Amino acid sequence: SVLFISDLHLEAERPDITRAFLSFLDERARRAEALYILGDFFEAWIGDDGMDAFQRSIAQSLRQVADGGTRIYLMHGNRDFLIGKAFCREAGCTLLPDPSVIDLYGEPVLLMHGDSLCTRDEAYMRLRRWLRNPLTLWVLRHLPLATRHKLARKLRKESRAQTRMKAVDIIDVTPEEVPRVMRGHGVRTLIHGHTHRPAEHPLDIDGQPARRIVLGDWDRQGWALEIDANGHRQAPFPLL
Ligand SMILES: CCCCCCCCCCC[C@@H](O)CC(=O)N[C@H]1[C@@H](OP(=O)(O)O)O[C@H](CO)[C@@H](O)[C@@H]1OC(=O)C[C@H](O)CCCCCCCCCCC
């Protein structure tokens, strides 16, 4: 079996989420063939060179699971798109680009964090285009660590202000983007996070049924999607 999680937003000041995650690693990820983390694993990331004691300890916990034979893949989200090779080497995980198509029990399956689908959120689309611009990444990594933390706090503050003001239809995925990107990748299954609305959505692509599975965020309870050759299930579990 294979596990999918996202939107944990791990941080030092949420030990309840950390405890749930570490229990999940021991109880479920150790026995899985693979674990996919589809973005926003951490609350924020300023670059691997800024990793703190807490973040290093999370890397070590992943490494224990990877060394047991579980393959771990990590995809960027909007909080942690600066995770690099140094972190993944310490964690024993593989960095997966957004988007990625994997083979899952013989079916091609598209994986994304999900924010790139939110094309009606024009203010966010503009921010994303600027944040991911190679010129932006260049200047950002030339900022001192403390100044990077300052700008990360400022972005979080403005995001918290602005997201409260937006309608749910503006911040959720644009419906017609889903068949468009799934057709382009030749898949009938898409798995993503970001939107915090765990669900499975049936849809049509060119007269053929397809599905979009949305992973849950861990703010109030943990979530995991588990797939094996016979079926799949997403279910929550309590934070510790
Ligand atoms: C190198 C270190 C520093 C730089 C890199 C740091 C990386 C870590 C920081 C993460 C910030 C991230 O939270 C921003 C973001 O992604 N917001 C969108 C997201 O909301 P979340 O709050 O992340 O859950 O998802 C929401 C739903 O999709 C969406 O709504 C939010 O997007 C916004 O709210 C964006 C606003 O609409 C526009 C904000 C522009 C802010 C400009 C601030 C800079 C000040 C400029 C002064 C001239």
Side-chain angles (χ1 to χ4, degrees), residues 201-229:
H201 300 264
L203 67 148
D204 185 84
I205 302 169
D206 303 336
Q208 158 162 88
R211 61 194 173 187
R212 175 176 62 99
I213 300 168
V214 180
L215 307 179
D217 73 283
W218 289 46
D219 185 62
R220 310 196 172 196
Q221 62 202 332
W223 286 94
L225 170 67
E226 183 162 21
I227 311 180
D228 64 23

Short mmCIF file of all heavy atoms in Angstrom, two decimals, residues 201-229:
data_model
loop_
_atom_site.label_atom_id
_atom_site.label_comp_id
_atom_site.label_asym_id
_atom_site.label_seq_id
_atom_site.Cartn_x
_atom_site.Cartn_y
_atom_site.Cartn_z
N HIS A 201 -14.03 13.66 -5.53
CA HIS A 201 -14.92 14.28 -6.51
C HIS A 201 -14.93 13.45 -7.77
O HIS A 201 -13.90 13.37 -8.45
CB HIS A 201 -14.47 15.69 -6.85
CG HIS A 201 -14.43 16.61 -5.69
ND1 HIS A 201 -15.47 17.47 -5.39
CD2 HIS A 201 -13.46 16.86 -4.77
CE1 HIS A 201 -15.15 18.19 -4.33
NE2 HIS A 201 -13.94 17.84 -3.93
N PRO A 202 -16.05 12.85 -8.13
CA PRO A 202 -16.14 12.24 -9.45
C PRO A 202 -16.34 13.33 -10.48
O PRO A 202 -16.94 14.37 -10.19
CB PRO A 202 -17.38 11.34 -9.34
CG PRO A 202 -18.25 12.04 -8.34
CD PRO A 202 -17.32 12.78 -7.39
N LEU A 203 -15.86 13.08 -11.69
CA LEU A 203 -16.03 14.01 -12.81
C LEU A 203 -15.94 13.27 -14.12
O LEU A 203 -15.63 12.08 -14.19
CB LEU A 203 -14.99 15.14 -12.79
CG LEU A 203 -13.51 14.81 -13.02
CD1 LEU A 203 -12.80 15.98 -13.74
CD2 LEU A 203 -12.78 14.49 -11.71
N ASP A 204 -16.28 14.00 -15.17
CA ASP A 204 -16.13 13.56 -16.55
C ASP A 204 -14.93 14.21 -17.20
O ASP A 204 -14.70 15.41 -17.03
CB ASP A 204 -17.36 13.95 -17.35
CG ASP A 204 -17.32 13.43 -18.76
OD1 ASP A 204 -17.70 12.25 -18.99
OD2 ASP A 204 -16.93 14.21 -19.64
N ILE A 205 -14.18 13.43 -17.97
CA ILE A 205 -13.20 13.95 -18.92
C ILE A 205 -13.47 13.28 -20.26
O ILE A 205 -13.26 12.07 -20.41
CB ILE A 205 -11.75 13.72 -18.49
CG1 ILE A 205 -11.47 14.34 -17.11
CG2 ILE A 205 -10.82 14.33 -19.52
CD1 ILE A 205 -10.15 13.89 -16.59
N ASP A 206 -13.95 14.05 -21.22
CA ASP A 206 -14.23 13.56 -22.58
C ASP A 206 -15.12 12.33 -22.57
O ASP A 206 -14.93 11.40 -23.37
CB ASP A 206 -12.93 13.29 -23.33
CG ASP A 206 -12.03 14.53 -23.40
OD1 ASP A 206 -12.56 15.66 -23.31
OD2 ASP A 206 -10.79 14.38 -23.56
N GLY A 207 -16.13 12.32 -21.70
CA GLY A 207 -17.11 11.25 -21.69
C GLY A 207 -16.68 10.02 -20.93
O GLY A 207 -17.31 8.97 -21.07
N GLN A 208 -15.60 10.13 -20.16
CA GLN A 208 -15.03 9.06 -19.38
C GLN A 208 -14.98 9.47 -17.91
O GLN A 208 -14.48 10.56 -17.60
CB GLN A 208 -13.61 8.75 -19.86
CG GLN A 208 -12.76 8.06 -18.84
CD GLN A 208 -11.57 7.39 -19.45
OE1 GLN A 208 -10.51 8.00 -19.61
NE2 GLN A 208 -11.72 6.12 -19.79
N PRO A 209 -15.43 8.63 -16.99
CA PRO A 209 -15.35 8.99 -15.57
C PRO A 209 -13.92 9.12 -15.09
O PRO A 209 -13.04 8.36 -15.50
CB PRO A 209 -16.06 7.82 -14.87
CG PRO A 209 -16.97 7.28 -15.92
CD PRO A 209 -16.22 7.40 -17.19
N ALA A 210 -13.73 10.07 -14.19
CA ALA A 210 -12.44 10.33 -13.57
C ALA A 210 -12.70 10.72 -12.13
O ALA A 210 -13.85 10.91 -11.72
CB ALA A 210 -11.69 11.44 -14.32
N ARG A 211 -11.64 10.86 -11.34
CA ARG A 211 -11.80 11.23 -9.95
C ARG A 211 -10.68 12.16 -9.50
O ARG A 211 -9.52 11.99 -9.88
CB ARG A 211 -11.82 10.00 -9.05
CG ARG A 211 -10.52 9.19 -9.11
CD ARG A 211 -10.66 7.81 -8.48
NE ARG A 211 -9.46 6.99 -8.70
CZ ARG A 211 -9.37 5.71 -8.38
NH1 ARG A 211 -10.39 5.08 -7.83
NH2 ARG A 211 -8.24 5.04 -8.60
N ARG A 212 -11.04 13.06 -8.59
CA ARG A 212 -10.10 13.97 -7.93
C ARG A 212 -10.22 13.77 -6.42
O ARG A 212 -11.31 13.93 -5.86
CB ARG A 212 -10.41 15.41 -8.31
CG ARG A 212 -9.57 16.47 -7.59
CD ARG A 212 -9.87 17.87 -8.08
NE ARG A 212 -11.22 18.32 -7.89
CZ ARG A 212 -11.63 19.11 -6.89
NH1 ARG A 212 -10.77 19.53 -5.99
NH2 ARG A 212 -12.89 19.49 -6.81
N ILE A 213 -9.13 13.37 -5.78
CA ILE A 213 -9.12 13.11 -4.35
C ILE A 213 -8.36 14.25 -3.67
O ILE A 213 -7.21 14.54 -4.04
CB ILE A 213 -8.46 11.76 -4.02
CG1 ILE A 213 -9.22 10.61 -4.69
CG2 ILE A 213 -8.45 11.52 -2.50
CD1 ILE A 213 -8.48 9.29 -4.65
N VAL A 214 -8.99 14.88 -2.68
CA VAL A 214 -8.44 16.05 -1.99
C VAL A 214 -8.06 15.63 -0.59
O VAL A 214 -8.90 15.11 0.14
CB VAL A 214 -9.46 17.20 -1.95
CG1 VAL A 214 -8.88 18.41 -1.22
CG2 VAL A 214 -9.90 17.56 -3.34
N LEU A 215 -6.80 15.85 -0.23
CA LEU A 215 -6.29 15.46 1.08
C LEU A 215 -6.64 16.50 2.13
O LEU A 215 -6.71 17.72 1.86
CB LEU A 215 -4.77 15.29 1.04
CG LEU A 215 -4.25 14.37 -0.03
CD1 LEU A 215 -2.74 14.34 0.07
CD2 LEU A 215 -4.86 12.98 0.04
N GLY A 216 -6.83 16.03 3.36
CA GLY A 216 -7.18 16.92 4.46
C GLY A 216 -5.98 17.51 5.16
O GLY A 216 -4.92 16.91 5.21
N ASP A 217 -6.18 18.68 5.74
CA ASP A 217 -5.15 19.35 6.52
C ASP A 217 -5.25 18.89 7.97
O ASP A 217 -6.29 18.39 8.40
CB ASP A 217 -5.30 20.86 6.41
CG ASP A 217 -6.47 21.37 7.19
OD1 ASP A 217 -7.59 21.21 6.70
OD2 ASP A 217 -6.27 21.87 8.31
N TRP A 218 -4.16 19.06 8.72
CA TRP A 218 -4.00 18.46 10.04
C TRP A 218 -4.28 19.43 11.20
O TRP A 218 -3.93 19.13 12.35
CB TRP A 218 -2.59 17.87 10.17
CG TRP A 218 -2.32 16.62 9.35
CD1 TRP A 218 -2.64 16.39 8.03
CD2 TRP A 218 -1.66 15.42 9.80
NE1 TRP A 218 -2.22 15.14 7.65
CE2 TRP A 218 -1.62 14.52 8.72
CE3 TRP A 218 -1.10 15.03 11.02
CZ2 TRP A 218 -1.06 13.25 8.82
CZ3 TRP A 218 -0.52 13.78 11.11
CH2 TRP A 218 -0.51 12.90 10.02
N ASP A 219 -4.92 20.57 10.95
CA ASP A 219 -5.05 21.57 12.02
C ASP A 219 -5.87 21.06 13.19
O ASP A 219 -5.61 21.39 14.37
CB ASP A 219 -5.68 22.84 11.47
CG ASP A 219 -5.71 23.92 12.51
OD1 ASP A 219 -4.61 24.32 12.96
OD2 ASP A 219 -6.82 24.30 12.89
N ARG A 220 -6.92 20.30 12.90
CA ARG A 220 -7.82 19.80 13.92
C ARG A 220 -7.76 18.30 14.13
O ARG A 220 -8.13 17.82 15.21
CB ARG A 220 -9.26 20.19 13.60
CG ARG A 220 -9.38 21.66 13.27
CD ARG A 220 -10.81 22.13 13.35
NE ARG A 220 -10.83 23.60 13.20
CZ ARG A 220 -11.87 24.35 13.52
NH1 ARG A 220 -12.97 23.77 14.06
NH2 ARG A 220 -11.75 25.67 13.35
N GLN A 221 -7.37 17.55 13.10
CA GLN A 221 -7.17 16.11 13.18
C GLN A 221 -6.22 15.72 12.06
O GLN A 221 -6.10 16.42 11.06
CB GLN A 221 -8.49 15.35 13.05
CG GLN A 221 -9.19 15.56 11.73
CD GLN A 221 -10.67 15.26 11.81
OE1 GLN A 221 -11.11 14.44 12.63
NE2 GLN A 221 -11.44 15.91 10.96
N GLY A 222 -5.57 14.58 12.24
CA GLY A 222 -4.75 14.04 11.18
C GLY A 222 -5.56 13.37 10.08
O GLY A 222 -6.70 12.95 10.28
N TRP A 223 -4.96 13.27 8.89
CA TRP A 223 -5.58 12.67 7.73
C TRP A 223 -4.58 11.82 6.97
O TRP A 223 -3.38 12.12 6.93
CB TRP A 223 -6.15 13.73 6.77
CG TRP A 223 -7.39 14.37 7.24
CD1 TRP A 223 -7.50 15.53 7.94
CD2 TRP A 223 -8.72 13.90 7.03
NE1 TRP A 223 -8.81 15.82 8.17
CE2 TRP A 223 -9.59 14.84 7.61
CE3 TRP A 223 -9.25 12.80 6.37
CZ2 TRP A 223 -10.97 14.70 7.59
CZ3 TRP A 223 -10.63 12.66 6.33
CH2 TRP A 223 -11.48 13.60 6.94
N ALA A 224 -5.08 10.75 6.37
CA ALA A 224 -4.27 9.98 5.44
C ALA A 224 -5.17 9.29 4.42
O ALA A 224 -6.22 8.74 4.76
CB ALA A 224 -3.40 8.93 6.17
N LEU A 225 -4.71 9.34 3.17
CA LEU A 225 -5.23 8.53 2.09
C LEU A 225 -4.32 7.31 1.93
O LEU A 225 -3.10 7.46 1.81
CB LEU A 225 -5.28 9.32 0.78
CG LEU A 225 -5.58 8.54 -0.49
CD1 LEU A 225 -7.00 7.97 -0.53
CD2 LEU A 225 -5.32 9.48 -1.68
N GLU A 226 -4.92 6.12 1.93
CA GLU A 226 -4.19 4.87 1.73
C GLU A 226 -4.78 4.15 0.53
O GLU A 226 -6.00 4.01 0.40
CB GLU A 226 -4.27 4.01 2.98
CG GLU A 226 -3.47 2.71 2.83
CD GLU A 226 -3.17 2.04 4.16
OE1 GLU A 226 -3.87 2.32 5.14
OE2 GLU A 226 -2.21 1.25 4.22
N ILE A 227 -3.90 3.70 -0.37
CA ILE A 227 -4.28 3.00 -1.59
C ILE A 227 -3.51 1.70 -1.67
O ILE A 227 -2.31 1.66 -1.39
CB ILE A 227 -4.02 3.87 -2.84
CG1 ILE A 227 -4.59 5.27 -2.63
CG2 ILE A 227 -4.59 3.17 -4.08
CD1 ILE A 227 -4.39 6.21 -3.79
N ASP A 228 -4.21 0.63 -2.05
CA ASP A 228 -3.52 -0.60 -2.41
C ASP A 228 -4.13 -1.13 -3.70
O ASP A 228 -4.93 -0.43 -4.33
CB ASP A 228 -3.58 -1.62 -1.26
CG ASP A 228 -4.98 -2.07 -0.94
OD1 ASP A 228 -5.87 -1.97 -1.81
OD2 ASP A 228 -5.20 -2.53 0.19
N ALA A 229 -3.76 -2.34 -4.14
CA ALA A 229 -4.20 -2.78 -5.45
C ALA A 229 -5.71 -2.98 -5.52
O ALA A 229 -6.27 -2.98 -6.61
CB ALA A 229 -3.48 -4.06 -5.85
#
